[PDB]
Amino acid sequence: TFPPASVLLFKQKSNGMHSLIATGHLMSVDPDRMVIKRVVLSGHPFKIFTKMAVVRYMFFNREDVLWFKPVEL
């Protein structure tokens, strides 16, 4: 659909009670805009030296760290 166009959104409360939630206008329509889903993996630094630290509770194997090695913290 070619812009401009209004963007209403409503949700079934119960038995056809369409309740309005969202409202806006139509941006560029194309599949090229790819969405990136993020995941934060947590940890705890239980040994602390000068600029070097041992952290647990982020993985549980050993070679998991060999799998997620180049990814920066």
Added chain:
Amino acid sequence: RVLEVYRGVREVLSKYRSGKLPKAFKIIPALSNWEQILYVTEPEAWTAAAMYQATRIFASNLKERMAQRFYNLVLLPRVRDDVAEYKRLNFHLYMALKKALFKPGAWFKGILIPLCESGTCTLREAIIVGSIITKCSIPVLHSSAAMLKIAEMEYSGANSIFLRLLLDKKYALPYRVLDALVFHFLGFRTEKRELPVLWHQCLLTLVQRYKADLATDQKEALLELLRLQPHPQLSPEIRRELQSAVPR
């Protein structure tokens, strides 16, 4: 025959890290001559784990008065040695104090009330024993009996903290312990002693939990005390909790 064996079990229990004990150990609640057994075993040379498992057998088997006199003659002096030495407690002895709370009656009559009867009833000893008391569950009637006996004493630094944690047991009281408490609070009425922060917290806990058993003359005695013995912070909270009460 006896002295050889119990000198042997002394030299075993002098470094007790682990290991299953012989049958010479586990019949001391059946040994009548256990006091003459007990000095050859040389009580201060023991590992605290030997203390732990000794209190384990002695709470799993004994009477009340033998448990009390073992708490008094053996346990309490080494407890004060380790607290005055370490200023902390060994975990074997800490769990051994839970093992000594495997009997509440000999605990109150032998350790706590004799600790405040000892006259040197300090602060860190009080915090340790009261935290362990807070951990365990004790009977209701003996809780009121212990509060009855603790209110009978002087005021050291260790009356209020045990009084506050026994209020943190949170049961419901008879009339006698309440009259004795409010009468002791009327004994602190015009005394110019700067009574600690933890005493104000103790009175605060008392009006928080026991707001349901206040008479009129008792409430006026409480207002007399709050009128004469303030603090810049907790006297208004005790005032507010006395302004939010329901009588008996």
Added chain:
Amino acid sequence: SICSTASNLYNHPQLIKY
């Protein structure tokens, strides 16, 4: 085989080239 893979460019949508 650790933090990389193939994932080549294959099969797209109908692009209406202006």
Added chain:
Amino acid sequence: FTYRGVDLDQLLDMSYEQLMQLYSARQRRRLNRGLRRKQHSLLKRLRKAKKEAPPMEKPEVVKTHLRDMIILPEMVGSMVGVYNGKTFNQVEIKPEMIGHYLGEFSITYKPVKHGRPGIG
């Protein structure tokens, strides 16, 4: 098989005192020192596990920590797991190892098979 001019039936029928000239320097040394109660109990578990097996069958493997055990020839024919820190390695005690220790049969680390230097 023969060891030092003595055969397997000859060894297994030989007394514990006469073994103590047929061994190495360390082994006669330790048998002079006399075995410990832990190793006595381990040999007792080996006796129980080698006896109760079916006669076609090899005995049930007994796992153990004690890497410093002299392989007595009475142990020959059993299967023993030897602990090298992580993993009980299960060795069939053949008669060729009667003058050694268990500890050499569960090789403790993994062999170094090099890579390449990065920033040196």
Added chain:
RNA sequence: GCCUGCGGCUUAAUUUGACUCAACACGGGAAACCUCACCCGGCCCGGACACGGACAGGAUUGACAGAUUGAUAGCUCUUUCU
């Protein structure tokens, strides 16, 4: 050639600070136990309060033997006695 440090490679772990003087046989550190500080397996328990169930018709500790995981782990299951 051998030996020791640093890096690097390996390993479950092959402990760690300094990084061209003042890094570098320094943390007295020459490692069979101690000197773990590393790894793999086990034991013992990791709270108080408030709600509902088991609870004296036992709640449950200790408790002698025999099977245990790598270990007399009665802290596992028959003895189920207390």
